[PDB]
């Protein structure tokens, strides 16, 4: 079974890996993200409930007045997406929130609140994305890319090498919340520990530790262990465990139980440890000079004198030892210090701790946070408790707590948003351990540590940023509001939140309009992951670590799709089968592998769980029953390829395309190309321009059937039905009986979009590709959009290409083209440019768009209409006034009598200024559409009336089609009900029943049914009239433009630009070039059969830049064309359908054990002829990214046709007419015309305008400006001689306000001699320095 569009023209496929997971929705990421944004979710989960329940409710300053939040709702969009595009307003929706003001009387803290005010209030509008994941803010379609940043949680960086130049590696722990204040623990070059709060002063960690009501003994018991020294008869015996002395030398005779164990000066070895553990002894004998090196743990108080003998973190001395012995403390707890197990880091941080108690710690940390402002202890504590433990300024999200609990090896993964003392204790212990040697650092180059945020999360963040401002506003407004004086509507304003969301969608480092030039760019732009913007690094401050791609990027992000230039690696494209995890990570599907069989199920593994299991090779030769043909298999354990067994593996790749992007999967024979060429090709395919007539690519990849369908460029069938009405503008389909709704249903209508300007000055047009009466299925394509062909992506065009030098015209990378290409309307494209004319309201009278243009003849005004706008279809090549804008300059109050008089008699209209808008000098073409928007109040000109009347006629045509269908059904029903009165029906109801429903007899049932049907009829008519009136009021409603404008006029100039020497064209393997010189058809080389070649590339570009696959593709292309040729030879000569069917079967049954297995005997024996007709142009061939056709398959496919097997054919010269030796290869290659047309690059200026800040010539191509003589150009010129040349290039041609005029006057008078003068910008610098307190002066 195959789809209906596949029955039109099924594409031959190769490959031997039967895929198990189909291609998912290419735009599922942003669609699912925005679906998670706007929806009623309980438990305050992602979207909008979290932002509300986190901020709301709000309470006054103990005023018993609370504002509760119940729910929210999104109203219907006030304008459709098409209406928003044609008008320019945003495709947004209202946000009505039902709030609850519960204010209660005084003298009752928890008194039962009464006089509840439950009210729905509107607060700003939010932009809704279309079915394609695009936002329409101001006419254009803006897409929000997903941002890759650091996952909230904890990280452990290892600063080595140059860091501190001391040869000591430091380890710094960073706690980064999702929203709040950071935390950073680190070590000095010494063994000191310090902490900082958001890049503040480096201060010790014991102070912030004791800030949370922590004493010294508690900290010491938490961090370090306890060594017990007992006061025995003498020698102060000590407990011993043979594992704590591992690695130390014996400074004394370690002997116990009357038996020597370790001698003085013997390092305790592992055998010594085993010997000391065999007897299991604890108490030994230790000298007096050994205790002096240790240090007491806790503060031991005296009971005789009531004083302190010794404090913590103070090394013991002999006098202190005698004191503590005479005090009576038998058990003395000391620290266990060992550089290999427990490095002393808290002891030093303790002895550098200036403050001891909790209160001075708080005031010191307050002084460290805020300069000065010395509070008391209770006033300072507010800051320390509000910065790290308040849920309003610390917002560790669910993924943050998850990563935090996973990093510290904790079972539970849930928690709160605020921190806790035990968490800080644990992270400090982890830092100490990772310094001691136990534990490894967490690299930043790991997808498990890099979190991806979608448009929904950024929108929620900005919503919260606005909500905190509105919260402060409503809190300061609630300071005076009392009971029974205000509804919960006036205290809330739309301003902050609405503006916040609007600016987040309008102007940001992520808010950009989509590059609407081809569906491939549309898909690769929405699946684009950036590292810039807020919360991400900058390209100017990025190291060689974020640019490099990790082995953890396998299947989660493409490694070959990257914009080469200023940001390499920072901007990537998501993988094909990559999905967004619930927590916000990159998940990749994998097939679960059991002992012997690989079950056809999928598990979406995360980034952290990759190293735990092992993944099997994607293209590993596998046997039946989910087995491997070989015992050993190529796998990867932890980002390292290796060789494993057939049973140790646990997971397999789902397919072979998940490693590349969707923009890279369309590169045929990608496995035969280098990484650099593949990157340059996949990037250039993004810049394809839609040709005038699309055409199927021969050497395809199979994925093309998805991009052109999964996107929103083509007309997809929402309900499969029968074609009713085919037209270039609209397509009307009749829904099948089953798919049709059982009530108030009808037929579907798709309004195709005609030639309209895109976001890159390209034409976007949809062409119907269905026939009348042809049944279509649901999801099938109906109309091919730009660069599409029967539901298949088709960017460029296939051409006959040879590879041989031709008189150096393909010198380095230049492309040679025959006149046959440009003559056949092949690469000619359409460019649509928008020109705006605004009638701004100024003083002295507003502007007019009339047609009375004085100081000019009729030739320049012959293209203007009665209203003052150029006609629809009026060509223009030079500067010509296409809209009659005039503005009054002096006295207003020009009487209408004298106004019409000036148009007939009298003098000219004075107060005009001739400020009309004309087309710039250099652009040509024919205007195809004019747009006008009039503010409510200004007189609508008759052209706007005509435009709205035309669109109303269109909408009325649709509504009348619907109404006539419903009325035909209803009249069939009335015929079915009055059949009882048959003779009068057939007599006086054949012609006149359509207007004479009035009948009557036999009341009981006939009157009942007739009345029911008449009621249905009048209700239907009234409903359709209501729909028509609503549409009229909608399309006639004037849109707002700006404060101080009357009307805005827009025109669209469409120019057809053909290929010419100077254009940039490229294949699909990074072989770019420029058309060197168009050639006559006779001069181009031709084969011994007479078919001339179209494109003659340079074969020398293949070896160095290793893109060989194209050649293969070329070969395959030839084979494809060959088959088509045969079909043409079978179509021109009238052949029976049996021979054609057998030939197509033999072609599709190529001997490669492919997974296609299509049969021709199942077709209708009629669509076979249509399919063959759709194959005479060639045989479309699909090719997986890595399972492509081998050499032998292409060889046998070529030998199927009459083409030579070697792929190289003898070629004759077009000029000399002789045979080229060394038979050149030739085939059919798919090429692309890049969006770098020469007509927008060539530019020149003799003498134009000059800047006002300094008298220097402008540049650019839009304005008539020259080029910039760069500083390196000045260096190269002064490296030469040319002193006069530099002096003229600097001031005489650019800056001399009085020299360039003199030089021009001399040149036009035949005088080639210059005058130095003085550069004006130098005087500008003199004035600027003089504007300062610095005096600059020229001497004699």
């Amino acid at each position: 079974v195959y789809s209906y569009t596949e029955k039109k023209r099924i594409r031959k496929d190769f490959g031997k890996r039967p895929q198990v997971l189909d291609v998912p929705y290419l735009l599922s990421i942003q669609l699912d993200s925005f679906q998670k944004f706007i929806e009623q979710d309980p438990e305050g989960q992602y979207g909008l409930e979290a932002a509300f329940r986190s901020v709301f409710p709000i309470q006054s300053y103990s005023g018993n007045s609370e504002l509760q939040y119940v729910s929210y709702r999104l109203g219907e969009p006030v304008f459709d997406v098409q209406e928003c595009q044609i008008r320019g307003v945003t495709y947004s929706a209202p946000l009505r929130v039902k709030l609850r003001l519960v204010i209660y009387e005084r003298e009752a803290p928890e008194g039962t609140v009464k006089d509840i005010k439950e009210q729905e209030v509107y607060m700003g509008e939010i932009p809704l994305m279309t079915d394609n994941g695009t936002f329409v803010i101001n006419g254009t379609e803006r897409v929000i890319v997903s941002q890759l940043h650091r996952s909230p949680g904890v990280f452990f960086d290892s600063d080595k090498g140059k860091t501190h130049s001391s040869g000591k590696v430091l380890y710094n722990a960073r706690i980064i919340p999702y929203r709040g204040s950071w935390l950073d623990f680190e070590f000095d070059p010494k063994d000191n520990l310090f902490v900082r709060i958001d890049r503040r002063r480096k201060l010790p960690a014991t102070i912030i530790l004791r800030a949370l009501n922590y004493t010294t003994e508690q900290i010491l018991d938490l961090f370090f262990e306890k060594v017990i020294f007992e006061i025995r008869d003498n020698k102060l015996q000590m407990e011993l465990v043979p594992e704590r002395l591992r690695g130390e030398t014996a400074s004394f005779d370690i002997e116990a139980n009357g038996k020597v164990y370790v001698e003085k000066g013997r390092r305790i070895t592992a055998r010594h440890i085993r010997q000391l553990e065999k007897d299991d002894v604890k108490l030994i004998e230790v000298p007096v000079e050994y205790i002096a090196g240790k240090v007491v743990a806790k503060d031991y108080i005296d009971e005789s004198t009531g004083e302190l003998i010794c404090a913590a973190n103070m090394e013991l001395s002999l006098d202190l030892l005698a004191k503590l012995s005479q005090s009576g403390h038998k058990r003395i707890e000391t620290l266990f210090t060992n550089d290999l197990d427990h490095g002393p880091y808290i002891s030093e941080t303790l002895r550098v701790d200036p403050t001891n108690d909790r209160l001075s710690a708080l005031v010191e940390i307050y002084r460290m946070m805020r300069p000065g402002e010395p509070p008391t202890r209770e006033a300072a504590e507010s800051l320390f408790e509000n910065l790290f433990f308040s849920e309003d300024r610390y917002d560790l999200s669910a993924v943050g707590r998850m990563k935090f609990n996973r990093s510290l090896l904790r079972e539970e993964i849930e928690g709160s948003g605020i921190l806790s003392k035990d968490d800080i204790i644990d992270v400090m212990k982890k830092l100490i351990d990772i310094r001691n040697g136990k534990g490894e650092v967490d690299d930043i180059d790991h997808l498990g540590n890099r979190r991806i945020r979608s448009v929904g999360e950024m929108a929620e963040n900005q919503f919260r940023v606005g909500l905190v401002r509105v919260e402060r506003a409503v809190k300061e407004r609630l300071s005076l509001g009392d009971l029974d004086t205000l509804m919960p509507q006036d205290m809330i304003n739309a301003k902050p939140i609405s503006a916040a969301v609007k600016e987040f969608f309008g102007s940001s480092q992520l808010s950009q309009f989509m590059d609407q030039n081809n569906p491939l760019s549309e898909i690769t732009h929405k699946r684009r992951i950036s590292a810039l913007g807020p919360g991400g690094l900058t390209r100017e401050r990025a190291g060689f670590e974020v640019r490099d791609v990790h082995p953890t990027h396998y299947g989660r992000v493409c490694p070959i799709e990257t914009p080469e230039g200023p940001n390499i690696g920072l901007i990537n494209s998501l993988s094909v089968y990559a999905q967004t995890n619930e927590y916000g990570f990159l998940e990749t599907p994998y097939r679960k592998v059991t002992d012997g069989v690989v079950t056809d199920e999928i598990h979406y593994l995360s980034a952290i769980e990759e190293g735990n299991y092992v993944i099997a090779q994607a293209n590993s030769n596998l046997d039946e029953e989910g087995h491997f043909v070989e015992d050993l298999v190529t796998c990867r354990s932890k980002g390292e390829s290796s060789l494993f067994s057939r049973d140790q593996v646990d997971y397999m790749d789902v397919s072979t395309q998940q490693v590349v992007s969707v923009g890279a999967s369309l590169i045929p024979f990608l496995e035969h190309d280098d990484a650099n060429r593949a990157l340059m090709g996949a990037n250039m395919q993004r810049q394809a321009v839609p040709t005038l007539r699309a055409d199927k690519p021969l050497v395809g990849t199979g994925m093309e059937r998805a991009v052109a369908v999964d996107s929103g460029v083509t007309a997809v069938a929402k309900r499969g039905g029968v074609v009713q009405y085919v037209d270039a503008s609209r397509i009307v389909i009749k829904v099948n009986e089953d798919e049709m709704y059982p009530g108030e249903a009808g037929i579907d209508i798709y309004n195709l979009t005609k030639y309209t300007r895109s976001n890159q000055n390209t034409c976007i047009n949809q062409m119907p590709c269905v026939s009348l009466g042809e049944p279509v299925e649901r999801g099938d394509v109906l109309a091919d959009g730009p660069s599409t062909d029967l539901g298949e992506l088709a960017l460029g065009q296939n051409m006959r290409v040879a590879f041989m030098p031709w008189n150096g015209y393909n010198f380095e990378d230049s492309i040679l083209v025959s006149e046959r290409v440009v003559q056949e309307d092949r690469f000619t494209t359409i460019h649509i440019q928008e020109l705006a004319c605004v009638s701004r309201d100024t003083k002295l009278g507003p502007e007019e768009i009339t047609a009375d243009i004085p100081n000019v003849g009729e030739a320049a005004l012959s293209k203007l209409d009665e209203s003052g706008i150029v006609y629809i279809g009026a060509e223009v090549t030079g500067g010509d006034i296409l809209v009659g804008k005039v503005t009054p300059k002096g006295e207003t109050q020009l009487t209408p009598e004298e106004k019409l008089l000036r148009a007939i008699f009298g003098e000219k209209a004075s107060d005009v200024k001739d400020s009309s808008l004309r087309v710039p000098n250099g652009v040509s073409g024919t205007v195809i559409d004019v747009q006008v928007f009039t503010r409510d109040g200004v007189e609508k000109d008759k052209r706007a009336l005509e435009i709205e009347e035309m669109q109303l006629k269109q909408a009325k045509k649709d509504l009348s089609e619907e109404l006539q269908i419903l009325e035909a059904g209803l009249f069939s029903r009335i015929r079915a009900v009055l059949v009882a009165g048959g003779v009068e029906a057939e007599k006086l109801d054949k012609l006149p029943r359509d207007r004479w429903l009035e009948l009557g007899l036999t009341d009981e049932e006939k009157q009942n049914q007739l009345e029911q049907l008449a009621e249905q009829y009048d209700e239907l008519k009234h409903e359709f009239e209501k729909k028509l009136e609503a549409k009229r009021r909608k399309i006639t409603q004037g849109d707002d433009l700006a404060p101080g404008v009357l009307k805005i006029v827009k025109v669209y100039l469409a120019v057809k630009r053909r290929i010419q020497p100077g254009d940039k064209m490229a294949g699909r393997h990074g072989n770019k070039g420029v058309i060197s010189k168009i050639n006559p058809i006779e001069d181009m080389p031709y084969d011994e059969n007479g078919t001339p070649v179209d494109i003659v590339l340079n074969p020398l570009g293949v070896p160095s830049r290793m893109n060989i696959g194209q050649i293969l593709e070329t070969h395959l292309g030839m084979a494809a064309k060959g088959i088509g040729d045969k079909i043409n030879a079978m179509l021109k000569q009238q052949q029976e359908v049996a021979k054609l069917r057998e030939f197509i079967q033999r072609a599709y049954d190529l001997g490669a054990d492919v997974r296609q297995k299509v049969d021709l005997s199942t077709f209708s024996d009629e669509e076979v002829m249509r399919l063959a007709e759709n194959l005479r142009k060639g045989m479309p061939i699909a090719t997986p990214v890595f399972d492509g056709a081998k050499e032998a398959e292409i060889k046998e496919l070529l030998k199927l046709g009459d083409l030579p097997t070697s792929g190289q054919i003898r070629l004759y010269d077009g000029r000399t007419g002789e045979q080229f030796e060394r038979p050149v290869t030739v085939g059919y290659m798919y090429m692309l015309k890049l969006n770098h047309l020469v007509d927008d690059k060539m530019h020149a200026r003799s003498t134009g305008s000059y800047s006002l800040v300094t008298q220097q010539p402008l540049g650019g191509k839009a304005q008539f400006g020259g080029q910039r003589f760069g500083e390196m150009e000045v260096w190269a010129l002064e490296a030469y001689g040319a002193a006069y040349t530099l002096q003229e290039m600097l001031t005489v041609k650019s800056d001399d306000v009085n020299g360039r005029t003199k030089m021009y006057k001399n040149i036009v008078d035949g005088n080639h001699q210059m005058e130095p003068g003085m550069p004006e910008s130098f005087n500008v610098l003199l004035k600027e320095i003089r504007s300062l307190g610095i005096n600059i002066e020229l001497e004699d």
Binding site: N1323, K1327, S1331, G1333
Partner: protein
Amino acid sequence: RERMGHIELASPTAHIWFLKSLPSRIGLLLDMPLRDIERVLYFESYVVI
């Protein structure tokens, strides 16, 4: 292009370039640490004369 005017400041002020040169001119000329000169400049302390 060349005619200039002026502003008669009621209070004579310091030139930030000569005060934030690192080393600043006044910081070396007046043999006074830049911290104290900045303290005097922003009116949070006094200097005797």
